[PDB]
Structure formats: structure tokens, C-alpha cells
Ligand binder design. Structure first.
Ligand SMILES: [Cl-]
Length: 148
């Protein structure tokens, strides 16, 4: 058989936990090799949400990795190197946009996609619920909502 896995990892900090482990361990290929190769090819996207595709032949266990690109927002920050508010969105609006992203690209978990929307809002100086989107992300990252 062949299996194609499409996931979103943190550029240069992929681990063998989830989601690579769940998705790949089954296919019985060395998850650590996969993780090494992915971290190699996402060096330049250190810390960014990067889409990745792994293509595996289950019989043979051979695989190959194809890397997408991060959001343009993230590429711009990076290029700028080394604080103003200009609009606000509700969290339900954030979920709306995140649902469109995920419909169009199923490799996104709703969590992933909210993450990215939150990230883009930061990059635009837009608060979510009057709050800083890094703030609001922590609230989510703890496990505190599932009710919006
Ligand atoms: Cl899709």
C-alpha cells in the first residue's frame, strides 16, 4: 500500500510525538529518520507552522518528504529579523476563518488552523476578544475552551 500523510509541524522543531508518531509509526517506518529529515528541510522555517507531506510505501517502508511553505506573514517577520492595536475580532470570527481554512485544506486540525489565524492576527496588530492573540492562544493551549 501507499499512504500519504499531510500534517503541520513546527519548522525545525518536529518531534516524534504527535502528530508524526501517530501518523507514521503505524506505517512502520523509522519515525526518527522522518523527524530528522523534516527538521533538516525546515531549518529556514525555524519555529513556523509548515505543511509537510510524507509519502510511504508500507510494504517496503521507504518514504519521502515534501515540504510546503509557511504563511506569508511568517516569512515576512523572519525577513524583518531582530506595539499597536488596529482592529479587533471575536473568537467566533476566528473560528469561522479557521473553519474555512480547514475545509480547503484538511491537513489542518481545527487547532492548527485557529493557531495560524491567531498568529496572523498578531502579525496584523489585531486583538482577539480585545486581548493579545498570544494571550488567547495560551488559554487554548492549556485546554480551556472547546465551548466557543
Ligand atoms: Cl484538502
Amino acid at each position: 500500500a501507499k499512504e500519504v500523510v499531510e500534517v503541520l509541524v513546527t519548522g525545525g522543531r518536529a518531534t516524534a510525538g504527535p502528530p508524526l508518531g501517530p501518523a507514521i509509526g503505524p506505517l512502520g517506518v523509522n519515525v526518527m529518520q522522518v523527524v530528522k529529515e523534516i527538521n533538516e528541510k525546515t531549518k529556514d522555517y525555524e519555529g513556523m507552522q509548515v505543511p509537510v507531506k510524507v509519502i510511504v510505501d508500507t510494504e517496503t517502508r521507504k518514504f519521502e518528504i515534501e515540504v510546503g511553505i509557511p504563511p506569508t506573514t511568517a516569512l515576512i517577520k523572519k525577513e524583518l529579523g531582530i506595539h499597536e492595536v488596529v482592529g479587533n475580532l471575536t473568537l467566533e470570527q476566528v473560528i469561522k476563518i479557521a473553519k474555512m481554512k480547514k475545509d480547503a485544506m484538511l491537513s489542518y486540525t481545527l487547532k492548527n488552523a485557529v493557531k495560524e489565524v491567531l498568529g496572523t492576527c498578531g502579525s496584523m496588530g489585531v486583538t482577539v476578544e480585545g486581548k493579545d492573540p498570544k494571550e488567547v492562544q495560551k488559554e487554548i493551549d492549556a485546554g480551556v475552551y472547546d465551548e466557543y
